[PDB]
Design a protein around this motif. Structure first.
Motif, PDB file in Angstrom:
ATOM      1  N   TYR A  13      44.433  42.400  46.333  1.00  0.00           N
ATOM      2  CA  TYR A  13      44.869  43.792  46.332  1.00  0.00           C
ATOM      3  C   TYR A  13      46.395  43.861  46.361  1.00  0.00           C
ATOM      4  CZ  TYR A  13      43.921  48.784  47.018  1.00  0.00           C
ATOM      5  OH  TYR A  13      43.814  50.145  46.857  1.00  0.00           O
TER       6      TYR A  13
ATOM      7  N   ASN B 159      46.812  41.765  42.421  1.00  0.00           N
ATOM      8  CA  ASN B 159      45.908  42.913  42.437  1.00  0.00           C
ATOM      9  C   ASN B 159      44.900  42.859  41.291  1.00  0.00           C
ATOM     10  OD1 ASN B 159      44.651  45.456  42.621  1.00  0.00           O
ATOM     11  ND2 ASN B 159      46.535  46.434  43.353  1.00  0.00           N
TER      12      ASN B 159
ATOM     13  N   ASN C 218      42.023  47.044  40.148  1.00  0.00           N
ATOM     14  CA  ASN C 218      42.236  48.257  39.366  1.00  0.00           C
ATOM     15  C   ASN C 218      40.944  48.713  38.697  1.00  0.00           C
ATOM     16  OD1 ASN C 218      44.934  48.517  40.025  1.00  0.00           O
ATOM     17  ND2 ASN C 218      45.677  47.481  38.176  1.00  0.00           N
ATOM     18  N   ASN C 219      40.079  47.754  38.386  1.00  0.00           N
ATOM     19  CA  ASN C 219      38.783  48.052  37.791  1.00  0.00           C
ATOM     20  C   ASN C 219      37.636  47.564  38.667  1.00  0.00           C
ATOM     21  OD1 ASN C 219      39.453  49.148  34.920  1.00  0.00           O
ATOM     22  ND2 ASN C 219      40.753  47.333  35.149  1.00  0.00           N
TER      23      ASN C 219
END
Length: 175
Positions: free
Chosen positions: A84, A112, A115-116
């Motif tokens: 993250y 990260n 995002n999906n």
């Protein structure tokens, strides 16, 4: 929503204890404000000992962190896998303090990938533990790094597919 569900301790445990992986813990206890990771490691050294690969699933609030303690070969090394946003330096040095107890630089791998994959921190923990067990003697720092890099190269449809497939396997342990 099952598709964006944050994995709890028991749900993550049931999946990770399914085939050394320690029970999921919180980093800092809310009331007494002790470092539970430090206390857990200390308790370990006094009893039997630390395995060649010690895996901790540490929760820092909204993060599920993969914390690996491994010897390679005479020197023990610490590895932090964050999927993250970057950890603040306060959280980081609570981990560093715990690392010193294990006998340790603390290698923070922060990328990260969510995002999906909403709240997929627990998902990547479950998946990478399987990777590290199929990796054997391979350097774990390059196992996780190249995995995260390759994961970013995937399309949204592929990343979202990973999200629903992994959750369907994880949820089974809790049912």
């Amino acid at each position: 929503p099952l598709g964006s569900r944050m994995l709890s301790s028991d749900e993550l445990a049931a999946a990770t204890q399914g085939l050394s992986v320690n029970y999921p813990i919180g980093l800092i206890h809310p009331t007494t404000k002790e470092n539970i990771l430090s206390t857990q490691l200390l308790e370990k050294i006094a009893q039997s000992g630390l395995s060649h690969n010690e895996v901790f699933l540490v929760n820092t609030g909204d993060h599920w962190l993969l914390c690996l303690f491994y010897k390679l070969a005479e020197k023990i090394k610490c590895l932090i896998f964050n999927t993250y946003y970057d950890l603040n330096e306060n959280t980081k040095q609570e981990i560093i303090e715990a690392a010193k107890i294990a006998g340790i630089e603390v290698n923070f791998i922060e990328m990260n990938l969510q995002n999906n994959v909403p709240n997929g921190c627990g998902l990547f923990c479950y998946h990478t533990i399987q990777l590290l067990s199929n990796a054997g003697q391979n350097d774990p720092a390059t196992t996780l790094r190249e995995f995260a890099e390759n994961f970013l190269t995937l399309s949204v449809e592929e990343q979202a597919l990973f999200n629903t497939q992994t959750r369907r396997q994880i949820y089974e342990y809790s049912l």
